[PDB]
Design a protein around this nucleic acid. Structure first.
Lengths: 97, 83, 95, 103, 105, 93, 78, 97
DNA sequence: ATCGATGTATATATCTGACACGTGCCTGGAGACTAGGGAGTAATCCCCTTGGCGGTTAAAACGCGGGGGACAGCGCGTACGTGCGTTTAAGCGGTGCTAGAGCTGTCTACGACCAATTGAGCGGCCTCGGCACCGGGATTCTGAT
DNA sequence: ATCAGAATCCCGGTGCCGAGGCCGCTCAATTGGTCGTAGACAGCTCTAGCACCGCTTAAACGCACGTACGCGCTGTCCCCCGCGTTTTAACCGCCAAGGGGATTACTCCCTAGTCTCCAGGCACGTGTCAGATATATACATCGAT
């Protein structure tokens, strides 16, 4: 059998998902999540498909920036694995509450 | 229909792909929880604004223009859905 | 002598209303004046942007209400909206 | 005046004049200055309330920039509001991280 | 030359910029040179972005500029990246970068 | 109805810069949004400048200094040069 | 010049920020960061003053420059 | 006697967080401001309140930077802030590229 | 070390649907005129910035021990990565409905604007009380035993 | 635990100057009235958001395996800290000069508003070629033997 050592498929996926532009969060689960979030705010609201798509683009961009800063923090802590403390520190430094 | 616990619809592989696009090589198993919560905290900050726009326009449909304006207010300007 | 305007007397009235046996310094008066001007600019700009977005030419009370709801945090926005609605209804009742 | 009709302490007239001269809209509704003055008055009442609380806790009768910084940052909602604002002569909140303190 | 764009040697519309400046509640009165100046600045900025986007598309051997090429153009130019640092481009993607410590030894 | 947009103008700019290149519809939307966003930035900055100097007019000088403020160094220099060249061309004819 | 921001001054600024231990190169790095920040803020302030056709950089120009950078400063009639 | 290394540091932290005084001496900072302003426009006059505002803004920005840098150093299992800490904080906050 | 398997890139056909162009229409832009206010400009006052000098003095600078901290090396295990069969349900696609965005007609009340009036608040001046400051005592710590 | 030793908190006296209140008035806020049009509301409509159902298959998932790094420990070595002493130039007080901030009065000319005209610009239709896809192969390289 052939089995890549850990860290090879991870890097290949990193390059693959940086080269492309397609959405990474599945469309229907994110639509349902957005509707769930909006349900607590005002009932019987409808979303244009472009609005859900815009929310998805913004959320993916925000999460990719967050994971970039989290990876920077993990490298700063002499680690390779990002941990919840990494994300928490990145969010605190960025100025998020 | 009532919607409950759809936050898990953002699957562990989805969080993994988002991190890989962000350059992360190794992801702890406890990340996939925190990120989801973080993601929720993001949406509750965008949608609350967008709905606030939609409520003002005497509308019941949250348009892409409302979400774009909400993101512009939050200092996260978005290009590609009108301006 | 140029007649510069500021919110000094109003802030003093509010302070004497919320804290009778309490004073305030000129340095804190400048901070309160700057804070009032900044929040005024924020709310007015947001309501202006709402007027632009709705393609409406007037900045009414509803735009101010929604700007308050956008800029202020949940409990603070709730209290401010309640206070604003109360004041608007009181002003409208009188003539 | 209009501040008396609305029970407000900030001036309705001044806010109405600034809205007109500030070029925020072509026309300003007559209810907008009242609402905006009410919101500004409430916000400054909250700020001065917490500042006075801090000053009494600090055994002083006059509010100084330090009291304003204490009031703004100690309250989570007001800190969220004025998150990107540096208050001159305000100082910082005394907080020392856990690991820094001696064993 | 009837149009003000032809008078200023510009492709962005001076008249439209003038109307937006007037009917945009920025000032009581709008000068006659401000629309020309603002249209020129806008034209220069979009020319700056489109030059880089076309170069990036040619690097990908594509005749059509897509959001990915615009994202590359914005994020590769350091000064343009500073102008649009807090801006999300839909379908833009991210720059291909891998930190040194994550690469195998 | 009429929906105003910068599609033809961005096409013109592209054809001046890249004679044999096209733009996708989504990239057109991005460019139209970028033009509007930079327009709002410059117009708002010049509006604040006019308010700050107690000036009721938004002339070429406020726009010039708005461009000098928002845009970065080399980009600001080139944009200012372009704007003043266009203003001179307009005034001349 | 930039060396006017002395080592004990940066030490006091770090102590106010809650720093317990300071490395030796932190002083040089902080001088560089402070110079960059002042370069940006003074550039914006000087642009404002030049537009106002003034030769005196007012505190109002400084407050406007800081507000433009998303660092609004209270206490100078902003 | 002699205080153990790390006690006077905490005492100074407590003393400088309870105070509002300027931590950068006024004349050196004023000369630095004039030096920097000479690069942009020669023969410039500065209001005393303008240099005051610059000094307050610089002190606040450096205090925020040192707070974030201390958080980074503490995250890295350290107590001593280092130039890597400051660079990481600036990179996350969005100033450094 | 040579060799085998798996992933990527590619060469080319194929088919499409998104894009560039043609055409028509009409709304927003262009041009000419007027009049009105806002802005450029010269005088003037005079505030406030710049500039120099001395004194005492807090603070910056320099040197030393060392003691705590950072950094490197090393061992352990575990949990995160990778693989694989399985099940989940996302995705694509045809059809149907209707709530609600969007456009349009009206007429109305609500806002701008102008004249007169006046008092709210700004500026300047004067007073004394709160906070700045300083010395002795308690204590609350911090360090060595 | 327990000892002394500094730093700091606490408290009373002092003192000083800026905050709090009063006088003048000025200029903008209030009030009354007329005009115009922004939009609030009722109507019509028709785009699209929702809902559904079915076939397909990409993606998620849970488990087996294993091994690479997170973490804890230990050792070293060094490099900031604390403190004392010498240096220095920040700081405060005081006076001088003058540069330019700001205000006023005057005048010109630059732009808003209005009306008439007509062409750029948008909406729609349509042909077609840049690009996405499924399939077959050469090529790189990473790992087991």
């Amino acid at each position: 059998p052939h089995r890549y050592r850990p860290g090879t498929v991870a890097l290949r996926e990193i390059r693959r998902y940086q080269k492309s532009t397609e959405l990474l969060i599945r469309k229907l689960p994110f639509q349902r999540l957005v509707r769930e979030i909006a349900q607590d705010f005002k009932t019987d609201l409808r979303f244009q498909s472009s609005a859900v798509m815009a929310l998805q683009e913004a959320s993916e961009a925000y999460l990719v920036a967050l994971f970039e800063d989290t990876n920077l923090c993990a490298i700063h802590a002499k680690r390779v694995t990002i941990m919840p403390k990494d994300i928490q520190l990145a969010r605190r430094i960025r100025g998020e509450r | 229909k009532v919607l409950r616990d759809n936050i898990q619809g953002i699957t562990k592989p989805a969080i993994r792909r988002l991190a890989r696009r962000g350059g992360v090589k190794r992801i702890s198993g406890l990340i996939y929880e925190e990120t989801r919560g973080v993601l929720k905290v993001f949406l509750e900050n965008v949608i609350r604004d967008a709905v606030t726009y939609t409520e003002h326009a005497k509308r019941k449909t949250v348009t892409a223009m409302d979400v774009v304006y909400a993101l512009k207010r939050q200092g996260r300007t978005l290009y590609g859905f009108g301006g | 002598k140029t007649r510069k305007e500021s919110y000094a007397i109003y802030v003093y009235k509010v302070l004497k209303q919320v804290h009778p046996d309490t004073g305030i310094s000129s340095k804190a008066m400048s901070i309160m004046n700057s804070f009032v001007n900044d929040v005024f600019e924020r709310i007015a700009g947001e309501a202006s942007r709402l007027a632009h977005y709705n393609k409406r030419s007037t900045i009414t009370s509803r735009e101010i209400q929604t700007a308050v709801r956008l800029l202020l945090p949940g409990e603070l926005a709730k209290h401010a909206v309640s206070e604003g609605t109360k004041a608007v209804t009181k002003y409208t009742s009188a003539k | 005046t209009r501040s008396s009709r609305a029970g407000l302490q900030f001036p309705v007239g001044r806010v109405h004049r600034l809205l007109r001269k500030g070029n925020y809209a072509e026309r300003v509704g007559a209810g907008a200055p009242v609402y905006l003055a009410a919101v500004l008055e409430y916000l400054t009442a909250e700020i001065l309330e917490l500042a006075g609380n801090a000053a009494r806790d600090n055994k002083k009768t006059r509010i100084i920039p330090r009291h304003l910084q204490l009031a703004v940052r100690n309250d989570e909602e007001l800190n969220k509001l004025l998150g990107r604002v540096t208050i001159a002569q305000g100082g910082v909140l005394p907080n020392i991280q856990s690991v820094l303190l001696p064993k």
